[PDB]
Design an enzyme around this catalytic site. Structure first.
Site, mmCIF file in Angstrom:
data_model
loop_
_atom_site.group_PDB
_atom_site.id
_atom_site.type_symbol
_atom_site.label_atom_id
_atom_site.label_comp_id
_atom_site.label_asym_id
_atom_site.label_seq_id
_atom_site.Cartn_x
_atom_site.Cartn_y
_atom_site.Cartn_z
ATOM 1 N N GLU A 197 0.844 -1.169 0.156
ATOM 2 C CA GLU A 197 -0.215 -0.014 0.086
ATOM 3 C C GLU A 197 0.490 1.154 0.114
ATOM 4 O OE1 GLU A 197 -2.779 0.071 3.411
ATOM 5 O OE2 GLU A 197 -3.255 2.316 2.508
ATOM 6 N N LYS A 239 -2.204 -2.070 -3.341
ATOM 7 C CA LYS A 239 -3.905 -0.750 -2.670
ATOM 8 C C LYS A 239 -3.452 0.091 -2.519
ATOM 9 C CE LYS A 239 -6.061 -1.183 1.975
ATOM 10 N NZ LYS A 239 -6.438 -1.331 3.265
HETATM 11 O O1 LIG Z 1 -3.979 4.786 11.523
HETATM 12 P P1 LIG Z 1 -4.222 3.261 12.031
HETATM 13 O O2 LIG Z 1 -4.279 2.951 12.988
HETATM 14 O O3 LIG Z 1 -2.518 2.525 11.416
HETATM 15 O O4 LIG Z 1 -4.876 1.983 10.407
HETATM 16 C C1 LIG Z 1 -4.433 2.880 9.075
HETATM 17 C C2 LIG Z 1 -5.661 1.903 8.435
HETATM 18 O O5 LIG Z 1 -6.807 2.357 8.997
HETATM 19 C C3 LIG Z 1 -5.445 1.809 6.636
HETATM 20 O O6 LIG Z 1 -4.683 1.289 6.791
HETATM 21 C C4 LIG Z 1 -6.136 0.988 6.108
HETATM 22 O O7 LIG Z 1 -6.345 0.181 6.187
HETATM 23 C C5 LIG Z 1 -6.392 1.603 4.534
HETATM 24 O O8 LIG Z 1 -5.550 2.981 4.329
HETATM 25 C C6 LIG Z 1 -7.448 1.806 3.751
HETATM 26 O O9 LIG Z 1 -8.524 2.745 5.086
HETATM 27 P P2 LIG Z 1 -9.236 3.927 3.739
HETATM 28 O O10 LIG Z 1 -8.641 4.820 3.156
HETATM 29 O O11 LIG Z 1 -10.278 3.157 2.854
HETATM 30 O O12 LIG Z 1 -10.295 4.114 5.256
#
Ligand SMILES: O=P(O)(O)OC[C@@H](O)[C@@H](O)[C@H](O)[C@H](O)COP(=O)(O)O
Ligand SMILES: O=P(O)(O)OC[C@@H](O)[C@@H](O)[C@H](O)[C@H](O)COP(=O)(O)O
Ligand SMILES: O=P(O)(O)OC[C@@H](O)[C@@H](O)[C@H](O)[C@H](O)COP(=O)(O)O
Ligand SMILES: O=P(O)(O)OC[C@@H](O)[C@@H](O)[C@H](O)[C@H](O)COP(=O)(O)O
Lengths: 358, 366, 358, 366
Positions: A197, A239
């Site tokens: 990603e 991603k």
């Molecule tokens: O800041 P955190 O607690 O580490 O969490 C990160 C996580 O939510 C993201 O890596 C999503 O897996 C991804 O970016 C897709 O999410 P969306 O961009 O579709 O909302």
């Protein structure tokens, strides 16, 4: 002239990763690229949860985070639209109401259990202020192997790029790509399909053309890094962010335009072998996420790979509100969740209908 | 046609690291590059201590390890030959007989306190079997800043390269160079002068020319990686292997030859600004380590950098034997150390006299 | 598990150029790095002669150009300050008063004959407007071999970088470095010591710091390209620009400052093995060129390499004026030439005295 | 902390080549990627015509070469199978039997005129003996713009890689890739769609796997060089070798294995935007070339790009023999040619019937 007998593995052309898991990696990729299905990103950190329990005002506790996941995972019939679930470390070791650990619960329903393996963002300490790198490579294999024993078969690692003044530093472009590439290799060696990603954040006043330029520049270096480290292309997934105008630009783009820019950039940077692209929602609204993906699966531009979703916010917003963090809200929350899941499922198939969200 | 206002820091030419510690890093480099002085590498891991304690049959305990270190750190007069000491994590917390922690003890005596910050070798998992990478970049700044507070002013990180079939994989050449380059950046940001150690190992049947080619190839990528990460050249040091034939080659190089090959390889790969090169002994006998350094410092080839030593095995072998463990052979231990430290101090200045060294020294290779 | 016998030359670590000329190339380098001596760049193209001939009312003909070269090459005594002369392709085939070709004449009088082998600047057609690449590699070995036959023992190739908006494009940084490295390899294979000239032009309004930043960035990549191509370091020379404020910056820099910035930049980018650095004057006045070189050779910074001059304008200006293109001005022109060559000679030694230039 | 205003063109992310010919370039790709159609490679050099006329005993003269190419260019109804023709320098200026230049002739006939712009192979002088580079970049825009004015709308440039001991040197991998990418850029700037040809030669004892590995390695670098130079992907074509065992390997691959290996290698290296891939016959027999292309267009692997042909030998061999260089043989010749043209046309559509083709085709590898 002088000849020398060397190990084939010491020759540049023979750097492709060698793992006994290859066969299983391809099989997982296969399940993760099922027509009409996508992934649920449920790996919010304990800090991100706090942000989630806001429009519903719920306290951030271990138990409530478990119920937060249970809301969507124990929702009867979700496997119809979801092929895999990206779990957070904590959730991996938690149990559903029926006593199965969440990985077991998912695996029993034919849903692939996944895991966020990165260790968070940190200042890049190179390039420009505001840029960030991602930690987590130290002791990677050890962690991954343990997650694999618990049932996980794929993982996710997130690196971010911040567009500032219409550009990003080469320090960031080079370093984050190398991080993602190394991550891909260690993952595959541990038996987990890596979801790479490289998110070019929506934050900023830039227009869609700037996003398009930076996304292409950032993505092609991720590909170059992957080739250097010899990743198994048949065994990974990308991603990315969709190519859209900045969040603070005040400009909007028609689905046809997002699909055009997003699909063009991917094709211009990604090897045709890449199995799939599971878009992150990253700031787009629930409806935008669906409309864009749908327009993307209707694009006449080349796109040999599976184009679907890996949404967190775009699949949880409504479900969380309707749920309100109360038991009595489960039925409604679950209904809200499946609807968003169904819309995105149809978007993947290019048959999304906006009237359905009216 | 179109113009845009960007941060200078976003342009490729402005990637040089910016740290308020720059002046201090430079000052430390000056101390670490003092005529007639080198470094003592006492950063053996807890496990490695079991390999040092075998011959003398000593119990591998935390108290014993402290004595193992104190054996030479307290040896009076050693700061005449040693300008810096690379300490192990555990030793940074231990105290000297005077009640002061070693970092404090060393500082008061003019010897700069150093710390080995890497987290050990691991399988590379890319390239050829047997190759290894080094971990430790996660939470690095946090660890480095703590060491800084305790008085440490420089650090050391080691990556290795195994010559097999006369070569090494590019996966190894590129990855370890990048690891080392990132390491240097995080150290300088944390206030520690980084000693970049890209060791091409003496293990194998390769001859001196093969070691020369591999070393040149490995070292230049380290330099390339350092340029991309924007290291402050005025504030770092290199700790390389000398270019010599392989341990199982069946050949032994004359001092002059080792000097030629080693100094020539450095010149063809290192920027003239590099302030200093501090050689590792890597298995050479105590005498060879002194003999070769002396020849290196008598090379007619270009070498703007300070050339010295940063020895572990070539400085503790005999001093450890004389010590044996009991505080009885302490005088005999600290006597064998100061002699080895004096032989290398002379070598740094190119005034080493083989006639003053024991007429018997066996390889320290394993 | 699997081994393969290959050519040692097929391995990355064995890319160093192999040529039977090595010993001769190094012998030539020694002569070109002789204390108190420098190089005379007399390789102006027909078009540049026009710029030199115009301000003295001299028609640009094949004969007047020879007389232009003869003015300096036959100024008996210049050999004391000049170890080598960079000739233009035309002059290589011309003759001195005694009937000897200039290369023969120079060789007989202790001067090494050199040749400018590049074929001119052209639009880069990549990166930013104004940037240029240099042509000349096609059929290079054939031309270089013909030059070696005529007595030439070293050559020169010039690439330029134009500082615009305080920066330069990576397209230029990379391409021109690759051009220079390839040129160096082909020169050595042909028995000609290559003088690598990556000129960061003084044109512009930038200050000395910007020149420092761009020069260091440009230099490093030239070195990186040289390493990739496996150049014989002990057999080549660098001909860079001194680091100084831009020509339209309206800012002046003291000799000691130029020395610090220049020497520091070379040290931070050049391998200690580089035999010599022969500076181009590139727009600096005759006096600044001597003053700056003098301070450079008094710098306390590391500088294992020989530091001297390879000047065109800075050694020819006053001489061309005193000469006036007239056979009756030869004596005056030659006194000015010897004087300038003498000042730079003492500058190389670090014994230049501004009072000597009044 | 400080800002600076720069040109957008000075920033790394904005390196895409900008040309007013983009639209026409893409339009040209559309024509060259028409289902059922391929390209005819008739860019043989005067020195290459010597070996083609050897069999039928024809003197290598400007006239005989004119007829040799006219044989195919004036073959009635070939436009149904050929979308474009790669001409040699002189043929660009030669005239058809109606008085107009071949480019004008082809254009009026719906066929696109192409020109081979490289100046031939030369020793690499780096890497390993036997490796070659290609010259021709000097004064390119001038030559290219001349061809464009004469009607040409696309070009071809060939670099070769020689597998030896199961590999090729990085010197060759990097240099030939950079040559191709610069060539591509200069071509698009001159209004010519560039056909990038990185031929990993069939020559050698190597098996299909070694060819696969080497091809993957060589092609990904070409792609890397193209991205660095900012090529317009939507306006270029690739002309690679198929992945098959060496000509001296003693092994021959089944159509479907070649399809698998070739398509897999292309997909692992080429960006999905790449308009098309026009294979070279590289020594395969006329039937092999057709069989393999058919199987390629029947592969279940990902392949977003138009997969077709751009053969020289595999399309002329028998047609040339039938012609014999005689005037009376034009009919016989043009039948064989239009036949092979139809066969590959079907193969492009994955509808090639091995029955409808010859029963015996000899190797065209020399
Ligand atoms: O800041 P955190 O607690 O580490 O969490 C990160 C996580 O939510 C993201 O890596 C999503 O897996 C991804 O970016 C897709 O999410 P969306 O961009 O579709 O909302
Ligand atoms: O095996 P560990 O526990 O990781 O410790 C190794 C450490 O002692 C050495 O790397 C020295 O810092 C240095 O390289 C000199 O070593 P010699 O080559 O002089 O013996
Ligand atoms: O543009 P042309 O006609 O090809 O000739 C250029 C030539 O005079 C210079 O490149 C010198 O060899 C060198 O750069 C020093 O020049 P100065 O900057 O010292 O005058
Ligand atoms: O010897 P030259 O003058 O360089 O000409 C070679 C030229 O005919 C070929 O390269 C074709 O353009 C193409 O590659 C198809 O070749 P094959 O299909 O016959 O293998």
């Amino acid at each position: 002239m002088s000849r020398v007998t060397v190990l084939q593995s010491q020759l540049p052309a023979y750097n492709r990763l060698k793992t006994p898991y290859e066969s299983e990696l391809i099989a997982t990729v296969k399940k993760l690229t099922t027509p009409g299905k996508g992934l649920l990103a449920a790996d919010e950190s304990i800090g991100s949860c706090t942000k989630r329990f806001q429009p519903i005002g719920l306290s951030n506790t271990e138990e409530h985070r478990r119920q937060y996941r249970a809301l969507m995972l124990e929702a009867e019939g979700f496997e119809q639209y979801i092929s895999g679930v990206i779990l957070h470390d904590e959730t991996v070791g938690q149990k559903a109401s029926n006593g199965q650990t969440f990985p077991e619960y998912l695996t029993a329903r034919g849903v692939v259990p996944g895991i966020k393996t990165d260790m968070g963002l940190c200042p890049l300490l190179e390039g420009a202020e505001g840029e960030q790198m991602t930690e987590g490579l130290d002791g990677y294999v050890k962690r991954a192997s343990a997650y694999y024993k618990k049932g996980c078969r794929f993982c996710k690692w997130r690196n971010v790029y911040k567009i500032q003044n219409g550009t990003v530093s080469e320090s960031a472009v080079r370093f984050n790509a190398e991080t993602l590439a190394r991550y891909a290799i260690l993952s595959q060696m541990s038996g987990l399909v890596p979801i790479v990603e490289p998110e070019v954040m929506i934050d900023g006043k830039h227009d869609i053309d700037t996003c398009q330029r930076v996304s292409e520049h950032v993505w092609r270096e991720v590909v170059a890094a992957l080739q250097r480290h010899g990743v198994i292309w048949e065994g990974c997934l990308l991603k990315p962010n969709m190519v859209v105008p900045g969040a603070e630009s005040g400009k909007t783009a028609a689905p046809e335009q997002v699909a055009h820019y997003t699909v063009m950039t991917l094709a211009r940077t990604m090897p045709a072998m890449l199995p799939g692209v599971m878009f992150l929602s990253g700031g787009l609204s629930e409806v935008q996420a669906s409309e864009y993906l749908n327009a993307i699966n209707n694009s006449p531009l080349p796109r040999p790979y599976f184009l679907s979703f890996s949404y967190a916010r775009a699949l949880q917003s409504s479900a969380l509100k309707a749920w309100g963090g109360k038991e009595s809200g489960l039925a409604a929350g679950r209904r809200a969740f499946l609807h968003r899941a169904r819309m995105n499922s149809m978007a993947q198939l290019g048959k999304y209908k906006r009237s359905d969200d009216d």
